[PDB]
Amino acid sequence: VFQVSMKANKYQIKKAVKELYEVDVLKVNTLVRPNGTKKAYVRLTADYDALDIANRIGYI
Amino acid sequence: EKAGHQTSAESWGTGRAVARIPRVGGGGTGRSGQGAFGNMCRGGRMFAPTKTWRKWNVKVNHNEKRYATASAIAATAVASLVLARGHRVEKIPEIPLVVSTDLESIQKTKEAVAALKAVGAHSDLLKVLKSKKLRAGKGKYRNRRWTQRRGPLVV
Amino acid sequence: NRKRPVPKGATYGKPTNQGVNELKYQRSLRATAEERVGRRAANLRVLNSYWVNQDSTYKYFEVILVDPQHKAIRRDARYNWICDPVHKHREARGLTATGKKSRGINKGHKFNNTKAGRRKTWKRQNTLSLWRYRK
Amino acid sequence: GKGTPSFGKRHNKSHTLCNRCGRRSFHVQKKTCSSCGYPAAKTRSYNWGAKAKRRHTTGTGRMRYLKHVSRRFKNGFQTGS
Amino acid sequence: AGVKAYELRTKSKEQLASQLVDLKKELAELKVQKLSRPSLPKIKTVRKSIACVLTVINEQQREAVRQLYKGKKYQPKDLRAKKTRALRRALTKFEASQVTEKQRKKQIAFPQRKYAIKA
Amino acid sequence: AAQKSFRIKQKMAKAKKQNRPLPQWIRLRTNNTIRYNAKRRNWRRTKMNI
RNA sequence: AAACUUUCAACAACGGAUCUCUUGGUUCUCGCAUCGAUGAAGAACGCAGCGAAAUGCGAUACGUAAUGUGAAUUGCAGAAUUCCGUGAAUCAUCGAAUCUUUGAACGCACAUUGCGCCCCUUGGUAUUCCAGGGGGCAUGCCUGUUUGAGCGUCAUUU
RNA sequence: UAUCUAGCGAAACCACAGCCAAGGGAACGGGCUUGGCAGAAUCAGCGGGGAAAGAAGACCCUGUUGAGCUUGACUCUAGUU
RNA sequence: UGGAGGUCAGUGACGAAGCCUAGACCGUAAGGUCGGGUCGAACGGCCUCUAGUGCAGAUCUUGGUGGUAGUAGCAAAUAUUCAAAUGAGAACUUUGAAGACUGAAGUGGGGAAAGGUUCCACGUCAACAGCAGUUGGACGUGGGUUAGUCGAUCCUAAGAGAUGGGGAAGCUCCGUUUCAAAGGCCUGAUUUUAUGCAGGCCACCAUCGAAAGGGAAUCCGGUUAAGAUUCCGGAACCUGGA
RNA sequence: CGAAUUUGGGUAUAGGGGCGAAAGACUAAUCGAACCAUCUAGUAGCUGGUUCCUGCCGAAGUUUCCCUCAGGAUAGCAGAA
RNA sequence: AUUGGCGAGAGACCGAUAGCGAACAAGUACAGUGAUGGAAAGAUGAAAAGAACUUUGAAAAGAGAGUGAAAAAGUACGUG
RNA sequence: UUGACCUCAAAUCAGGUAGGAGUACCCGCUGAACUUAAGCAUAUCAAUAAGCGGAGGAAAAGAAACCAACCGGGAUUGCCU
């Protein structure tokens, strides 16, 4: 789950997650939150573990 | 010129149990429905607003001006008039008080004070110095904060 | 003529102002011709204009204009005076020959109302001049 | 009833936000802002509306560029370091 | 206090780009920490350092373009002067000082003289 | 309405984030007379009418 | 006789008059001339470690650079020998930049964060499709360039 | 429902007020004059009075104040001929 | 009475100005002077100057406050009751038990316009819920809205509206195909040479305008405190690409 | 109460204008001419109010003219110098 | 010439119902569909030294105590 | 079989320019009525307010198709008159 630039689309979110975290993402679903910010749910492939990558980023 | 008139107030007329003064229209403010435009009204224009084309300077005949100046000079030589005006000249030998042109050529404030002391105007100096007081009203915040007496006029 | 561009007939005005038909525009057909030309070619400056033809419906004029930004005019001081900002839309402000004629800008006793400007003269002679020592 | 029962029927905005000024003054069907005159080139202004001119004028906003013009003039419109 | 522009200006394109990239990585990690930690004022100087790097890079690029256009007329509008619209439309010094040859002859022949009167 | 436009939704977000009480430390700042949020809004009390 | 009601005083009560104050007005005077297609004024949305406003600013976002000063900022908390110094600061100055979506507002639209078209690069075993990065495409008018049109018209044709 | 209680709690009105008879008086008094009289604090009703309240009478007149409408009013005017 | 010029070398933090006082004196009065309380930084006498200079009224203005008055009242929509819990406190909160009501053009389950976070979780009396409140659509802090398939987006309707042109001093008005020289897809060109070229068809005659009209395509089961035809599992479909 | 029906949304018509199966009806609680700002502090022979004390003097409701009759000018009455 | 803009100096002006509407997060809050309309709101103290602690109360708070020149200055704050 | 001229076009051709803001003052256009006339229509208000176009630090005007009638002055603009 990510806070995303409001001007970003699913293509850019996919590409940026791939280039930042060296993971392969399966699907991207975005919404605009009632506070006016973009929220992205990026589901990765079965090869990668979201908890693994979250612990790599730093938040447990 | 637009103070008290930056309003679109209209009279409500008779039949609404209120005075016929113009009232602010609209709603949801508290300013709405309130009297306007009048000298009796809060926020209304003052009665006969002050204008800048009031006569400020006053013309006096040249001859009357010179008459008054001559009378004032001649009063400077009357010993009693100076006392009545309150100028602490009780220790001066005689008036009119005439001094030498060395005073014209004097240079420093300390030596001018010494000249005044040697001649007899220092009591007038002390009167001026000790009469300094705060003004007695709203003149303090109009760049007129203090008032003091007038000392000697060195001509 | 310049027909008054308001029916509804509802002027609530006086019979002196009631007239509609025989009213005359105070600027010349030449003046409106060069104003329209200047609005079309707003990047140029109306230097002058002259009459070429007329029929019942139309009057025809030719307008001379100068480009203030062409270097052939910006140099060559014979005509660079018009490249200064004070000459923006002389046709609109009435500073051309027809404009001055319509404004009445002429010397003499016949133009006492309009020499330095009609409204300027009116303001000057309707001002109340008060000196510090009232005269 | 022309009062309360008729007030119950107002749910169709005749004005929406205007692009030029965010004032809820853009008439939807006329496609014109009742405040600034958008989409006309000239912002709407009248000499009987002095208060309105006060509300909509230079210095009521950030003056993102015009605020520094006096400083640049006072410095002579210099260039360099 | 972050990086310093005078020591950034000697760095080259590759070094500045790498510095910007690692500064961005540090800022991202710092946003992650700020999520879990109440006060993180180090993010302030990290953002400042990113701004310093970006302005040094931009100044280098603009100087390169200025050198590329040096001498030849028709410089890019963002590069040429800005003074005001009217100051740009006004006649140049040369154009304003232009006079016709008739006036040139007149000025040469009859200039305003320097005279005094005493007795 | 549910089927909003992005302009209306952005105005919604702006109003929502504005609608919060004054921070507690601005009150403690020196030469500070602001004691509470005067521009506070409730959805029942005053409508934004956009 | 009490209660109750009136009058007065003392003390205590919403009230905010009066007095004193005043970084505000309002008039007068002097000096100066500087907005914008190199995108103005205005608008919207955002940016602070902890904040939403005529605070400031623009994704380089309570700001960057340059310069001056010379040790702060401060409500709390903090990267840091930042302190005999290319150096603190919500400092001043300000000439380098950045300057989101707009707006005269300019690809076409715009109650849509809607639709194109053209170059170059990258990715998808692709000049055509899709995607990403960058740069563009308004109108009137002027001067010039190139390509044209019209038996409007000039020098060769049984 | 009213009514009594717990809680909560306005408004219209208000010169000062609040018992009558007659007199006179701006010719229909709560006050004034002469009489009748006259005892705290009050509750529920009530609609005689307060010439009760609601509104600078909308009828009428006046004003050298309007406006809507009409026409062989006065003076013009768009159109049309 | 507010300001101003002179003067009293005037009064004053050892208490100025204000304010309170059925205390005193003076003056016919306007008013002046003083005693006692309150307090906290300026103020007054005299000779003159000046004016935004004195209030009981103006259905005066703006604020504040009364009697009325603990009064009118809080009476429409059948209706509540017992116990327990929580709590300082329960007619009103929660949970059981009973009695009822809406009675499927509902007091049910969804939506449109509108609202804008009221949704959902966590904490108690300041206000609010015309009684109360431990409850709340209130307060504080947070969380929440996931789409190739549902809408918008596309189309045109009534209509709106640029351009070409013509009016108008002009802001602008008309006009929408009109008295206009009004543009776009395939192989040859696709590298000693470009998108230049006898390469072809030609002639919509801007654009905007519907979350109810027309229209490419998704269903079931499960999942959340709060989202789901959107997430997960399974199973499909449509459009565009050698 | 199956239609000259009822109604949502879109759209057109704007103030001496619109719209009206016609009531001067309706045109945002506004209609025999909407609302907003300005001209405008519109004019008012008309109503209301018009702020300290003491001292001295002290009236008129009549004449003439006036589209004059709720007003004014004029003479008279009064004050002051 | 100059009720705008920028800079500066003044006043027998006003002194928080005054002076600009606005001395304050004022063209702000709120009222209207809209054009538009448009307030109220300054003062503790030299310094928060903004009342530790004890007691009653469920709590607000009270009573003591405390700081202060004054708490007849307690944020609902200059005399009130 | 070719080369020009004239006029009129096209281009995301090369380079420019115009629009908008502000408007106290300035240059024009357009233009009322309230008001005064004790009514009112010419007049007045006023060649004003509102509306529209266009500049600058000032603008405009400006070196006589002037004023004069004198023994003649001598661009323009302002002040006193």
PDB file of N, CA, C and O in Angstrom, chain B residues 31-58:
ATOM      1  N   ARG B  31     -24.727  43.014  10.834  1.00  0.00           N
ATOM      2  CA  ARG B  31     -24.740  44.327  10.213  1.00  0.00           C
ATOM      3  C   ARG B  31     -25.994  44.554   9.380  1.00  0.00           C
ATOM      4  O   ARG B  31     -26.379  45.708   9.157  1.00  0.00           O
ATOM      5  N   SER B  32     -26.653  43.483   8.945  1.00  0.00           N
ATOM      6  CA  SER B  32     -27.848  43.607   8.122  1.00  0.00           C
ATOM      7  C   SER B  32     -29.034  44.075   8.956  1.00  0.00           C
ATOM      8  O   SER B  32     -29.237  43.625  10.087  1.00  0.00           O
ATOM      9  N   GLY B  33     -29.829  44.977   8.383  1.00  0.00           N
ATOM     10  CA  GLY B  33     -30.956  45.554   9.081  1.00  0.00           C
ATOM     11  C   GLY B  33     -30.610  46.668  10.041  1.00  0.00           C
ATOM     12  O   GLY B  33     -31.489  47.112  10.790  1.00  0.00           O
ATOM     13  N   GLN B  34     -29.368  47.136  10.043  1.00  0.00           N
ATOM     14  CA  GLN B  34     -28.907  48.140  10.987  1.00  0.00           C
ATOM     15  C   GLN B  34     -28.945  49.529  10.363  1.00  0.00           C
ATOM     16  O   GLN B  34     -28.765  49.691   9.155  1.00  0.00           O
ATOM     17  N   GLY B  35     -29.183  50.531  11.207  1.00  0.00           N
ATOM     18  CA  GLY B  35     -29.241  51.897  10.721  1.00  0.00           C
ATOM     19  C   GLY B  35     -27.923  52.339  10.116  1.00  0.00           C
ATOM     20  O   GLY B  35     -26.844  51.915  10.532  1.00  0.00           O
ATOM     21  N   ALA B  36     -28.020  53.204   9.110  1.00  0.00           N
ATOM     22  CA  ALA B  36     -26.849  53.656   8.376  1.00  0.00           C
ATOM     23  C   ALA B  36     -27.064  55.086   7.899  1.00  0.00           C
ATOM     24  O   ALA B  36     -28.157  55.647   8.015  1.00  0.00           O
ATOM     25  N   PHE B  37     -25.981  55.677   7.393  1.00  0.00           N
ATOM     26  CA  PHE B  37     -25.928  56.920   6.623  1.00  0.00           C
ATOM     27  C   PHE B  37     -26.078  58.193   7.445  1.00  0.00           C
ATOM     28  O   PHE B  37     -25.764  59.276   6.937  1.00  0.00           O
ATOM     29  N   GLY B  38     -26.475  58.106   8.706  1.00  0.00           N
ATOM     30  CA  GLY B  38     -26.875  59.282   9.453  1.00  0.00           C
ATOM     31  C   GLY B  38     -25.881  59.621  10.543  1.00  0.00           C
ATOM     32  O   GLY B  38     -25.143  58.767  11.027  1.00  0.00           O
ATOM     33  N   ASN B  39     -25.875  60.901  10.927  1.00  0.00           N
ATOM     34  CA  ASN B  39     -24.977  61.338  11.991  1.00  0.00           C
ATOM     35  C   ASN B  39     -25.339  60.697  13.323  1.00  0.00           C
ATOM     36  O   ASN B  39     -24.455  60.443  14.148  1.00  0.00           O
ATOM     37  N   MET B  40     -26.625  60.425  13.546  1.00  0.00           N
ATOM     38  CA  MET B  40     -27.063  59.768  14.770  1.00  0.00           C
ATOM     39  C   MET B  40     -26.712  58.289  14.788  1.00  0.00           C
ATOM     40  O   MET B  40     -26.762  57.665  15.853  1.00  0.00           O
ATOM     41  N   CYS B  41     -26.357  57.718  13.642  1.00  0.00           N
ATOM     42  CA  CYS B  41     -26.173  56.283  13.508  1.00  0.00           C
ATOM     43  C   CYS B  41     -24.731  55.880  13.779  1.00  0.00           C
ATOM     44  O   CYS B  41     -23.790  56.625  13.495  1.00  0.00           O
ATOM     45  N   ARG B  42     -24.571  54.682  14.329  1.00  0.00           N
ATOM     46  CA  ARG B  42     -23.253  54.102  14.539  1.00  0.00           C
ATOM     47  C   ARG B  42     -22.699  53.624  13.203  1.00  0.00           C
ATOM     48  O   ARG B  42     -23.311  52.783  12.535  1.00  0.00           O
ATOM     49  N   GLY B  43     -21.545  54.155  12.813  1.00  0.00           N
ATOM     50  CA  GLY B  43     -20.981  53.883  11.511  1.00  0.00           C
ATOM     51  C   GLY B  43     -21.483  54.782  10.406  1.00  0.00           C
ATOM     52  O   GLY B  43     -20.990  54.681   9.276  1.00  0.00           O
ATOM     53  N   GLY B  44     -22.448  55.652  10.693  1.00  0.00           N
ATOM     54  CA  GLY B  44     -22.913  56.600   9.709  1.00  0.00           C
ATOM     55  C   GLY B  44     -21.975  57.777   9.558  1.00  0.00           C
ATOM     56  O   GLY B  44     -21.029  57.963  10.320  1.00  0.00           O
ATOM     57  N   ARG B  45     -22.248  58.586   8.541  1.00  0.00           N
ATOM     58  CA  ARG B  45     -21.429  59.758   8.281  1.00  0.00           C
ATOM     59  C   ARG B  45     -21.689  60.830   9.334  1.00  0.00           C
ATOM     60  O   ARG B  45     -22.818  61.010   9.793  1.00  0.00           O
ATOM     61  N   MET B  46     -20.630  61.532   9.727  1.00  0.00           N
ATOM     62  CA  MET B  46     -20.744  62.615  10.691  1.00  0.00           C
ATOM     63  C   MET B  46     -21.555  63.772  10.111  1.00  0.00           C
ATOM     64  O   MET B  46     -21.691  63.927   8.897  1.00  0.00           O
ATOM     65  N   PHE B  47     -22.115  64.587  11.002  1.00  0.00           N
ATOM     66  CA  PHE B  47     -22.832  65.775  10.559  1.00  0.00           C
ATOM     67  C   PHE B  47     -21.852  66.797  10.005  1.00  0.00           C
ATOM     68  O   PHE B  47     -20.846  67.111  10.647  1.00  0.00           O
ATOM     69  N   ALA B  48     -22.166  67.332   8.822  1.00  0.00           N
ATOM     70  CA  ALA B  48     -21.344  68.328   8.146  1.00  0.00           C
ATOM     71  C   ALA B  48     -19.884  67.898   8.167  1.00  0.00           C
ATOM     72  O   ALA B  48     -19.081  68.480   8.907  1.00  0.00           O
ATOM     73  N   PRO B  49     -19.511  66.875   7.397  1.00  0.00           N
ATOM     74  CA  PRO B  49     -18.139  66.362   7.468  1.00  0.00           C
ATOM     75  C   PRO B  49     -17.124  67.452   7.174  1.00  0.00           C
ATOM     76  O   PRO B  49     -17.333  68.310   6.314  1.00  0.00           O
ATOM     77  N   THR B  50     -16.024  67.416   7.918  1.00  0.00           N
ATOM     78  CA  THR B  50     -14.991  68.428   7.766  1.00  0.00           C
ATOM     79  C   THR B  50     -14.393  68.363   6.368  1.00  0.00           C
ATOM     80  O   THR B  50     -14.135  67.283   5.831  1.00  0.00           O
ATOM     81  N   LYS B  51     -14.191  69.533   5.775  1.00  0.00           N
ATOM     82  CA  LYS B  51     -13.660  69.653   4.429  1.00  0.00           C
ATOM     83  C   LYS B  51     -12.324  70.376   4.472  1.00  0.00           C
ATOM     84  O   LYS B  51     -12.059  71.169   5.379  1.00  0.00           O
ATOM     85  N   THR B  52     -11.478  70.088   3.486  1.00  0.00           N
ATOM     86  CA  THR B  52     -10.166  70.714   3.442  1.00  0.00           C
ATOM     87  C   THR B  52     -10.214  72.156   2.957  1.00  0.00           C
ATOM     88  O   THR B  52      -9.266  72.903   3.206  1.00  0.00           O
ATOM     89  N   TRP B  53     -11.289  72.581   2.290  1.00  0.00           N
ATOM     90  CA  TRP B  53     -11.368  73.960   1.830  1.00  0.00           C
ATOM     91  C   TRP B  53     -11.895  74.907   2.898  1.00  0.00           C
ATOM     92  O   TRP B  53     -12.308  76.024   2.573  1.00  0.00           O
ATOM     93  N   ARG B  54     -11.884  74.488   4.161  1.00  0.00           N
ATOM     94  CA  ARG B  54     -12.013  75.430   5.261  1.00  0.00           C
ATOM     95  C   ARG B  54     -10.871  76.438   5.195  1.00  0.00           C
ATOM     96  O   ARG B  54      -9.776  76.130   4.722  1.00  0.00           O
ATOM     97  N   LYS B  55     -11.136  77.665   5.635  1.00  0.00           N
ATOM     98  CA  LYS B  55     -10.080  78.672   5.669  1.00  0.00           C
ATOM     99  C   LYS B  55      -9.105  78.332   6.788  1.00  0.00           C
ATOM    100  O   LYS B  55      -9.484  78.289   7.962  1.00  0.00           O
ATOM    101  N   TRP B  56      -7.848  78.077   6.428  1.00  0.00           N
ATOM    102  CA  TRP B  56      -6.810  77.738   7.395  1.00  0.00           C
ATOM    103  C   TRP B  56      -5.919  78.934   7.709  1.00  0.00           C
ATOM    104  O   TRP B  56      -5.783  79.325   8.871  1.00  0.00           O
ATOM    105  N   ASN B  57      -5.308  79.524   6.688  1.00  0.00           N
ATOM    106  CA  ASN B  57      -4.500  80.717   6.879  1.00  0.00           C
ATOM    107  C   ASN B  57      -5.386  81.954   6.911  1.00  0.00           C
ATOM    108  O   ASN B  57      -6.446  82.004   6.281  1.00  0.00           O
ATOM    109  N   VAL B  58      -4.940  82.962   7.654  1.00  0.00           N
ATOM    110  CA  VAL B  58      -5.693  84.194   7.840  1.00  0.00           C
ATOM    111  C   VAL B  58      -4.838  85.362   7.375  1.00  0.00           C
ATOM    112  O   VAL B  58      -3.672  85.484   7.767  1.00  0.00           O
TER     113      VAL B  58
END
